[PDB]
């Protein structure tokens, strides 16, 4: 038959927000635990704490989503991303998409006020 792969979870839409909260915290634990494996697979310059910080920021972004269906989709996609990272299916190039700040300073001029944005036609 056609069997599932490493760290594959069948898609199940949780009927309750608490039963989803359990699964979500388990996924967060999985990510935090895989951080050192990630740093080894993807030959990263930065530290393991930086990876774990990034993971926290990712999970933080959806801290206030209310609709159960949306949380279900966010969870299923987050698990897909975990499976992609832990199996080394990603290359370094796509993994480093998650760490834009880790790259060096892009230049002297990142405008913040109106006048600087207006001088670069970005007002």
């Amino acid at each position: 038959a056609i069997i599932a792969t490493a760290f594959a979870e069948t898609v199940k839409f949780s009927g309750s927000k608490q039963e989803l909260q359990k699964r979500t915290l388990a996924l967060y634990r999985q990510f935090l635990r895989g951080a050192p494996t990630f740093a080894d697979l993807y030959e990263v310059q930065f530290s393991i704490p930086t990876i774990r910080t990034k993971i926290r920021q990712e999970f933080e972004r959806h801290r206030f989503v209310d609709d159960l269906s949306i949380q279900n989709v966010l969870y299923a996609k987050g698990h897909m991303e975990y499976q992609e990272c832990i199996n080394f299916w990603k290359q370094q190039a796509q993994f480093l998409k998650y760490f834009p700040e880790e790259d060096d300073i892009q230049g002297r001029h990142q405008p913040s006020n109106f006048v600087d944005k207006f001088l670069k036609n970005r007002a």
Binding site: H62, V65, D67, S69, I70, V73, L74, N121, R122
Partner: protein, 123 residues
């Protein structure tokens, strides 16, 4: 109104700093056919810096706006508004204009004039 923005995978700038227009195509002044005027188009307003510029090698028109050629079709103004809200898009509705009806009679070309003719109709 479900915030499907956060599940689509589109860039955040699309639901933050872009405006769309929802309208019906006007009856073209060059033709008598009205076949393209019933759909509700949704398309993006242009961005000044990124819209179009001349390439210095061969003269092609470059662009930085990935939405510049995209146009959605909807069967009703309400469907379009619903979709735009579901994507978190700021929109403007341009209400369509229609030809005011009047009665036209061929015989009116020959009505007897009791005083001085205001103009010579020629046919």
């Amino acid at each position: 109104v479900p915030a499907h923005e956060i599940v689509s995978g589109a860039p955040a700038e699309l639901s933050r700093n872009r405006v769309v227009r929802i309208y019906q195509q006007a009856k073209p002044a060059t033709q008598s056919g009205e076949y393209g005027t019933f759909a509700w188009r949704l398309d993006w307003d242009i961005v000044d810096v990124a819209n179009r510029w001349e390439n210095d090698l061969i003269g092609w028109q470059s662009s930085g706006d990935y939405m510049q050629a995209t146009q959605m079709k909807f069967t009703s103004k309400e469907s379009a508004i619903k979709f735009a809200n579901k994507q978190g898009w700021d929109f403007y509705i341009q209400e369509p204009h229609h030809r005011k009806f009047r009665v036209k009679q061929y015989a009116n070309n020959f009505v007897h004039s009791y005083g001085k003719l205001k103009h010579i109709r020629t046919k």
